Design a protein around this ligand. Structure first.
Ligand SMILES: *[C@@H]1O[C@H](CO)[C@@H](O)[C@H](O)[C@H]1NC(C)=O
Ligand SMILES: *[C@@H]1O[C@H](CO)[C@@H](O)[C@H](O)[C@H]1NC(C)=O
Ligand SMILES: *[C@@H]1O[C@H](CO)[C@@H](O)[C@H](O)[C@H]1NC(C)=O
Ligand SMILES: *[C@@H]1O[C@H](CO)[C@@H](O)[C@H](O)[C@H]1NC(C)=O
Ligand SMILES: *[C@@H]1O[C@H](CO)[C@@H](O)[C@H](O)[C@H]1NC(C)=O
Ligand SMILES: *[C@@H]1O[C@H](CO)[C@@H](O)[C@H](O)[C@H]1NC(C)=O
Ligand SMILES: [Zn+2]
Lengths: 195, 596
């Protein structure tokens, strides 16, 4: 074979960073094979908004965008077009007319530590709602009070980020879930990627 | 930019941080209870200290937002919970001496032991030996000796400490916005800001008074019957017109009359329903007991249990080298962790206890969506009330026959039902006048109505007038009888049990009407009724977000606690009591006393 699509790398990455700064992976010019994707673990949530999973092979895409992050179980429902919620409006907002597949599978067996995995963080205080497909990594003292924060925290001045504490004893609904959102873009230029 | 907007973000941050800190405190507690070691003790102490420090810091932070500027009626409740001022508003030395008094009282009650005079051969503690003697022994002299010995051992030591305690708690309440510590405790039922559903602190007194005035006839007939049976037992120590003596009630205090069932059972030929031998002969164990309870809670409409619950919960005692507390308890560790700690054995009592604990866990699951400060029962009584309603529903002969523990060829008669109702009466009705009397006396002592030189005199006069119980040996002001009870010694609210007793029967009446039941209320099974489960879930999902008046409206259609459910429950036993006591003087006179 000439090429392969790095689908085995977007998954099986052993680390998904966080969702406040979601990893953005751009894939192009490769042979698209979804056998490994379907051969990975059974998926808690696999919803495709644009194309049927089989007809994905019939349609050729120049640009494929992959976004990988870890969120709680109940926050998966927030990652959907037209959803209102903390994660949806402050961490990662899909567009209203999003065309892509949202793939989620449990990561409690690997990414949960008894002491508490505080590496993964999410944002819970932002000045306004995020525009679709945006990544905001700026972390300065939130100014909730009408008095100037003067660069410090405490009274009416908080930090924009709060981490999840993931432990294996947690029940479903707060266990860490690995979500890899695939985004497809079509623009008027020669694609030259098919099979 | 406003008070409300500022308060919202602070509440969100506090809820998120408190979730994790409460989870580590609860996990430390669970580890210590399951497996007691020095490392676990240190971990639990550290987690508790961290949680207390966080609560104090956030409470001091939250006082900035005035409660007149908040108009959501939910943020207001969360801020009231935060600003409840659990951290002492009094001085440092005053807080230290209050803690000293509480610790001394708890230590005295826990380590209280009684020996023979000038004889160290035997020294009995309260729970192991003294409670056993009170429960089983039939000797009038021994019972009087044990009662007087406990009172002389504990009350003489605890009287001045309790006087200092009442003074200090009144000072603390005056330092806060409440009047007395009785007002502080009554504030748990206070609901303000919601027109058409409000509850006032002063309304609880009137509601409890009216409820007891309604209960009075049934309790009077029960007292007459028990007095007649105890006259048959002890020939001359009980007067046909006199009040029942205290030490003969069954337990050290008279809170429960269940120990009198063996002496005062109406019909002894037909035994009460027992399923232990049947469970052994059908080869049942604790795991399948909990599985059957899960099936019942599914059938009523409540959700199934968690795989994590099944994996982490220890429903059997490990034994051997491992030592753990065996008091049944349902743990809501938080963030989806629900567990039960119960040394379950193959008994009908353990089956009912498992149903009670799974009712607890189902309530905890129901209020899981609400914020941390609201993740509780609407008041102090609904949580145990929900446990108890499932306990009564799962004990019916119909349910036992359906599950198969009893032989389906069996049929029930009048004597069995009367005996079961009388046992439940001694368990339930008996504790109501005692709870009412104790709470009234404690409220009056807090309010200062009862002077120090007349504390015990008024206590015994009110007990004689209300509960119809008189002390064997008269006690002057030196003794402090109420301090003997664990709740009074450790300063726990005690009207919770009265409220729960009314609430469980109201819930049962509502759910039985929902489940399309025809017949007397005691033989009510809600096994396969899906409508009753949803009608209960309408309250279970709320938590503390809505007032308890609105929750009670959602369940039973009434905004106030009612005792007619209890009266309708005990109607057949009341008919039996009317038949039995037709020749007996119902009531009691205050003049008679054991001492002459
Ligand atoms: C504040 O009021 C809104 C009503 O729009 C409600 O949705 C929200 O839950 C309230 N706040 C809290 C903390 O419940
Ligand atoms: C709690 O105590 C602080 C101590 O400074 C006081 O300012 C505040 O008013 C108190 N709050 C209540 C509700 O009593
Ligand atoms: C979930 O409930 C169904 C019945 O509603 C039951 O068969 C199943 O065992 C439950 N799941 C777990 C993990 O107990
Ligand atoms: C209790 O926990 C400790 C530490 O986790 C462990 O070594 C021990 O085996 C457990 N059980 C007992 C009975 O100590
Ligand atoms: C009903 O109960 C009474 C108890 O006084 C008993 O005498 C009577 O025989 C019972 N009825 C039947 C049909 O057993
Ligand atoms: C309740 O439903 C179960 C499951 O179908 C059934 O076995 C049982 O007999 C039902 N209860 C009664 C009283 O029939
Ligand atoms: Zn309970």
């Amino acid at each position: 074979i000439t090429n392969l699509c790095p689908f085995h790398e977007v998954f099986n990455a052993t680390t998904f960073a966080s969702v406040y700064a979601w990893n953005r992976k751009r894939i192009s010019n490769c042979v698209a094979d979804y056998s490994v994707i379907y051969n990975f673990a059974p998926f808690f949530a696999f919803k495709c908004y644009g194309v049927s999973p089989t007809k994905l092979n019939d349609l050729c895409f120049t640009n494929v965008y992959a976004d990988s992050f870890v969120i709680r179980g109940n926050e998966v429902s927030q990652i959907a077009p037209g959803q209102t919620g903390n994660i949806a409006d402050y961490n990662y907002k899909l567009p209203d007319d999003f065309t892509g597949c949202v793939i989620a599978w449990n990561s409690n067996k690997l990414d949960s530590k008894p002491s508490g995995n505080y590496n993964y963080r999410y944002r819970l205080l932002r000045k306004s709602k995020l525009k679709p497909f945006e990544r905001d990594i700026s972390t300065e003292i939130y100014q909730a009070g009408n008095k100037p924060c003067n660069g410090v925290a405490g009274p009416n001045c908080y930090s924009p980020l709060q981490s999840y504490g993931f432990r294996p004893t947690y029940g479903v609904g707060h266990q860490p879930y690995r979500v890899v959102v695939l985004s497809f873009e079509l623009l008027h230029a020669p694609a030259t990627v098919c099979g | 930019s406003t008070i409300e907007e500022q308060a919202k973000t602070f509440l969100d941050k506090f809820n998120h941080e408190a979730e994790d800190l409460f989870y580590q405190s609860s996990l430390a507690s669970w580890n210590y209870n399951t497996n007691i070691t020095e490392e676990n003790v240190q971990n639990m102490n550290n987690a508790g200290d961290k949680w207390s420090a966080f609560l104090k810091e956030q409470s001091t932070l939250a006082q900035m937002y005035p409660l007149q500027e908040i108009q959501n009626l939910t943020v207001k409740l969360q801020l009231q919970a935060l600003q409840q001022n659990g951290s002492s508003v009094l001085s440092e030395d005053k807080s230290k001496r209050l803690n000293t008094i509480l610790n001394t009282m708890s230590t005295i009650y826990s380590t209280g032991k009684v020996c023979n005079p000038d004889n160290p051969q035997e020294c009995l503690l309260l729970e192991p030996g003294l409670n056993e003697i009170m429960a089983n022994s039939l000797d009038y002299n021994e019972r009087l000796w044990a009662w007087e010995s406990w009172r002389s051992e504990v009350g003489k030591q605890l009287r001045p400490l309790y006087e200092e305690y009442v003074v200090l708690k009144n000072e603390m309440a005056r330092a806060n916005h409440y009047e007395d510590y009785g007002d502080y405790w009554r504030g748990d039922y206070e609901v303000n800001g919601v027109d058409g559903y409000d509850y006032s602190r002063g309304q609880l007194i009137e509601d409890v008074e009216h409820t007891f005035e309604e209960i009075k006839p049934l309790y009077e007939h029960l007292h007459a019957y028990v007095r007649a049976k105890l006259m048959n037992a002890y020939p001359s120590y009980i007067s046909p017109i006199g009040c029942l003596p205290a030490h003969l009630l069954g337990d050290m205090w008279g809170r429960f009359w269940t120990n009198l069932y063996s002496l005062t059972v109406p019909f002894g030929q037909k035994p009460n329903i027992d399923v232990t031998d049947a469970m052994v002969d059908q080869a049942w164990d604790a795991q399948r007991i909990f599985k059957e309870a899960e099936k019942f809670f599914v059938s009523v409409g409540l959700p199934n249990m968690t795989q994590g619950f099944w994996e982490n919960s220890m429903l059997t005692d490990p034994g051997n080298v491992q030592k753990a507390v065996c008091h049944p308890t349902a743990w809501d560790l938080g963030k989806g962790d629900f567990r039960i700690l119960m040394c379950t054995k193959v008994t009908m009592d353990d089956f009912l206890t498992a149903h009670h604990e799974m009712g607890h866990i189902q309530y905890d699951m129901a209020y899981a969506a609400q914020p941390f400060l609201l993740r509780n029962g609407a008041n102090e009584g609904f949580h145990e009330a929900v446990g108890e309603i499932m306990s009564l529903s799962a004990a019916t002969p119909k349910h036992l026959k359906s599950i198969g523990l009893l032989s389906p060829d069996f049929q029930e008669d009048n004597e069995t039902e009367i005996n079961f109702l009388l046992k439940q009466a001694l368990t339930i009705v008996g504790t109501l006048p005692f709870t009412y009397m104790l709470e009234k006396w404690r409220w009056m002592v807090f309010k200062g109505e009862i002077p120090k030189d007349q504390w015990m005199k008024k206590w015994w006069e009110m007990k004689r007038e209300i509960v119809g119980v008189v002390e064997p040996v008269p006690h002057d002001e030196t003794y402090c009888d109420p301090a003997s009870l664990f709740h009074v010694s450790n300063d726990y609210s005690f009207i919770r049990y009265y409220t729960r007793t009314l609430y469980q029967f109201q819930f049962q009446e509502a759910l039985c009407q929902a489940a399309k039941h025809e017949g007397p209320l005691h033989k009510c099974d809600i096994s396969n009724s899906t409508e009753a489960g949803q009608k209960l879930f309408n309250m279970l999902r709320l938590g503390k977000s809505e007032p308890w008046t609105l929750a009670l409206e959602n369940v039973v259609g009434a905004k106030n606690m009612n005792v007619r459910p209890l009266l309708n429950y005990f109607e057949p036993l009341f008919t039996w009591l009317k038949d039995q006591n037709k020749n007996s003087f119902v009531g009691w006179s205050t003049d008679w006393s054991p001492y002459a």
